[PDB]
Amino acid sequence: MISLADLQRRIETGELSPNAAIAQSHAAIEAREKEVHAFVRHDKSARAQASGPLRGIAVGIKDIIDTANMPTEMGSEIYRGWQPRSDAPVVMMLKRAGATIIGKTTTTAFASRDPTATLNPHNTGHSPGGASSGSAAAVGAGMIPLALGTQTGGSVIRPAAYCGTAAIKPSFRMLPTVGVKCYSWALDTVGLFGARAEDLARGLLAMTGRSEFSGIVPAKAPRIGVVRQEFAGAVEPAAEQGLQAAIKAAERAGASVQAIDLPEAVHEAWRIHPIIQDFEAHRALAWEFSEHHDEIAPMLRASLDATVGLTPKEYDEARRIGRRGRRELGEVFEGVDVLLTYSAPGTAPAKALASTGDPRYNRLWTLMGNPCVNVPVLKVGGLPIGVQVIARFGNDAHALATAWFLEDALAK
Amino acid sequence: MISLADLQRRIETGELSPNAAIAQSHAAIEAREKEVHAFVRHDKSARAQASGPLRGIAVGIKDIIDTANMPTEMGSEIYRGWQPRSDAPVVMMLKRAGATIIGKTTTTAFASRDPTATLNPHNTGHSPGGASSGSAAAVGAGMIPLALGTQTGGSVIRPAAYCGTAAIKPSFRMLPTVGVKCYSWALDTVGLFGARAEDLARGLLAMTGRSEFSGIVPAKAPRIGVVRQEFAGAVEPAAEQGLQAAIKAAERAGASVQAIDLPEAVHEAWRIHPIIQDFEAHRALAWEFSEHHDEIAPMLRASLDATVGLTPKEYDEARRIGRRGRRELGEVFEGVDVLLTYSAPGTAPAKALASTGDPRYNRLWTLMGNPCVNVPVLKVGGLPIGVQVIARFGNDAHALATAWFLEDALAK
């Protein structure tokens, strides 16, 4: 993988030139695209910018995120050749920082369940996860130092775990979803894919200019609370192997780890997530569902069909349960600085299964809005397994700090 | 003005056909558009639907809201001929209810300060208000029964007041802002314009399918709390004359009115509304400001150029203040059912002032998220004056009931 921070430092000390950095990505992409299929379109003419912390940094953009110079096809035939008039605000945050928009990465149709052609860098016979399939795969294949994706259920954490890359889902609404195809406005959150925690940090700093993302340093003796999300069901062995590996490493590094069971209010918030997601999806994809029903990919079309009956009443109750859950989650963070759990059910599913993986271990947090970071831990049978670091809402900076701490911890 | 409720009942019993109703609006638009200029585009071919609670109901759409069959130019030359691919969810809410999208109503450039060419229906020498200029002017001129607009500061209530039409800015996020050109995502709220409060209820019921809007009826002896928003300075005589006339009409109608002070926390919220608004504005229009700076309407260009320096720090600090204002505001409704205040600084300014009017008596409420309803009180010099009925967050139904009550109270 390509480290953004590494590129940054080297370019800063005139050790590496921006044009060089960019030319390397163009090479890295072509070098493996016919094998991974991470890009919907690759702008081979993209060049480094003159100034800015992100000059020489090539970035991939999930194709539900508007670009003014490239089509944004939403992963649907319904939007084939669709060309937005402007760049999404998050794309502008990168461009303003000096970034190079090297292309649009693949995405499941409307960021849902329908698999793309993208394959896992670690194993071409496996899925790279979803819905940010291309962003995760491309960063995992060492094609680009950064990529943007989005999360409604678990389209950022899950695929990063499956592809063995670091990633983060900032606190809800921190990054604007303006010019980002909506699935569910109560959940939709933009995310970043990088090689390491430090890379995500420098990316957020550049995009937002928020001081809390400046000079972040690994956490010292973090207080960690381990939650296995029992309510989500039975986890796969490989996922547990990684969690135990992560726990053991953290303990050796000085962390105090303690198991904990989440409040009943949280179990509930987790159960009604589908309600909020699906009731809104029907409002959000009204035009598509009414005028182009049959053109909506199979899996998404089926879940929308099964849920046309959701009512505003049960939708409102779902949200009350959501709020209850947030208020009680905050209490948990009194005795811990972070929570550590699974990032996915297990290693990435074989492509033959036609599944991008179950978001059951991710969905809850998207609803709570807390910052989440995926920390690569190990690999079983060649397929990556990561753990998920979660902090109090608004403390994205510490989450990355602890994730960083964990990365070093695992490296011993 | 055309009553949505009236047409609904006459169409239901069979007294009026949907085709006739739509042919009615087309003619009404024809008869006045040349002198009011409320539409950016009037679809003369738009036909009625055979079924649905809104069949035979023509609706005007503020031009920052996406439509699939008509351009959405954002009141800006930057978007001349811009054609969205899909209808915005709120537009689909209307279409699914059986309504007819009759045209796009004028909006100031990106819904900010820059005046449109629309004129006040009550006196063409005056402003119809902004930014939802066309939507208010069209309904106020008896052209159409309903119209959608938006409010970041006071774009729904103020223009409604100026044109003497009923209108409601529902509870924040009840109506999705997907497909609605973003100004400030923490503020932007879709709203409706109609003849009377009842037409609003019916409009929301059909769009949302929420039972709270079903069977609404005038309120009885409401507990009204009068707030004059002193923090926003004194209003103009005409505005106070209209407020005093509403209190008197309500009292004489059985209501109990008591003057109230707003918690200091709320005053502070009104103060930092501009920080949240303009800061987010800069992210939401990053493409416009960076790529087409000089093409941005003068006034908005100036306000943006002046807020370039706002920091994430003062922004976070402003939001924090906004949340406190919300909690404590909820306290105020523990002894009162609704708040009664000003809808605008006074009567509509003369076009010669190149001003859509100061939103200072509107902005707070948009930040708090509460449902607000404009109630036409009287007229000074022929120019309409209204008052604003505000209920707790999520009590739109009651805000409409008290508005309906006040309307009857003023009818003596």
Side-chain angles (χ1 to χ4, degrees), chain B residues 43-278:
Chain B
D43 187 344
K44 294 189 177 60
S45 88
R47 309 190 90 282
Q49 299 196 67
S51 66
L54 291 182
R55 61 188 187 293
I57 300 298
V59 180
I61 308 301
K62 183 183 178 176
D63 218 34
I64 51 170
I65 302 185
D66 294 344
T67 47
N69 61 323
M70 290 176 265
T72 308
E73 310 180 313
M74 321 301 170
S76 181
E77 46 175 83
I78 298 178
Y79 287 78
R80 184 76 169 73
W82 176 240
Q83 180 55 266
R85 172 57 169 148
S86 59
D87 285 308
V90 291
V91 168
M92 286 303 305
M93 286 178 143
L94 293 167
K95 301 215 305 176
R96 291 180 163 188
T100 292
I101 305 301
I102 200 159
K104 310 304 295 296
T105 55
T106 65
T107 179
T108 54
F110 303 100
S112 194
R113 293 187 304 170
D114 298 278
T116 67
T118 303
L119 308 177
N120 196 309
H122 297 285
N123 182 305
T124 63
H126 289 256
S127 166
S132 308
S133 309
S135 289
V139 170
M143 287 181 209
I144 54 183
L146 193 78
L148 290 188
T150 58
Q151 175 163 314
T152 301
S155 287
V156 177
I157 299 298
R158 192 169 84 260
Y162 286 175
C163 302
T165 78
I168 178 172
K169 168 220 140 299
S171 295
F172 187 56
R173 289 187 301 197
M174 180 190 85
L175 294 180
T177 50
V178 175
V180 177
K181 184 62 174 169
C182 183
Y183 186 173
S184 173
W185 61 86
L187 295 166
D188 296 354
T189 307
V190 179
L192 288 73
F193 298 84
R196 306 192 55 191
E198 166 179 43
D199 305 304
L200 297 181
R202 299 267 93 204
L204 289 172
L205 176 59
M207 284 172 81
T208 63
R210 314 192 59 170
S211 61
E212 59 180 290
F213 297 118
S214 184
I216 285 175
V217 137
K220 301 304 181 187
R223 243 158 302 167
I224 301 182
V226 172
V227 299
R228 284 190 172 73
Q229 307 184 66
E230 305 73 12
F231 42 84
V235 80
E236 285 159 38
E240 171 66 14
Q241 289 166 47
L243 179 58
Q244 279 176 49
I247 291 175
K248 181 181 183 301
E251 284 181 357
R252 223 173 76 167
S256 58
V257 185
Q258 50 173 292
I260 299 183
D261 277 296
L262 293 171
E264 178 56 54
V266 176
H267 296 213
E268 278 300 74
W270 171 88
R271 186 180 69 76
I272 53 75
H273 169 280
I275 299 298
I276 291 182
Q277 181 192 64
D278 300 329

Side-chain angles (χ1 to χ4, degrees), chain A residues 68 77-79 82-87 89 92-93 95-96 172-176 178 181-182 185 208-210 212 279 282-292 295 312 315-316 319 323, chain B residues 68 77-79 82-87 89 92-93 95-96 172-174 176 178 181-182 185-186 208-210 212 279 282-292 295 312 315-316 319 393:
Chain A
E77 318 161 296
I78 292 176
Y79 287 76
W82 173 244
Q83 179 61 238
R85 175 91 174 88
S86 57
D87 285 308
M92 286 301 298
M93 293 177 148
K95 304 206 315 172
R96 286 186 166 188
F172 187 63
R173 302 180 82 88
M174 201 213 100
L175 294 176
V178 172
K181 191 59 178 163
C182 184
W185 63 86
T208 65
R210 308 176 70 70
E212 59 275 20
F279 179 86
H282 269 290
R283 269 68 266 168
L285 292 175
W287 179 79
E288 290 78 352
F289 192 81
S290 303
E291 321 286 16
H292 302 279
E295 313 180 27
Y315 164 61
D316 293 319
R319 291 185 304 166
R323 286 172 293 190
Chain B
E77 46 175 83
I78 298 178
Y79 287 78
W82 176 240
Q83 180 55 266
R85 172 57 169 148
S86 59
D87 285 308
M92 286 303 305
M93 286 178 143
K95 301 215 305 176
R96 291 180 163 188
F172 187 56
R173 289 187 301 197
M174 180 190 85
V178 175
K181 184 62 174 169
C182 183
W185 61 86
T208 63
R210 314 192 59 170
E212 59 180 290
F279 179 82
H282 264 285
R283 307 322 134 207
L285 299 163
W287 179 78
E288 295 70 15
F289 188 78
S290 296
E291 308 287 11
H292 306 282
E295 310 169 28
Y315 167 68
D316 286 324
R319 297 200 283 85
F393 182 66

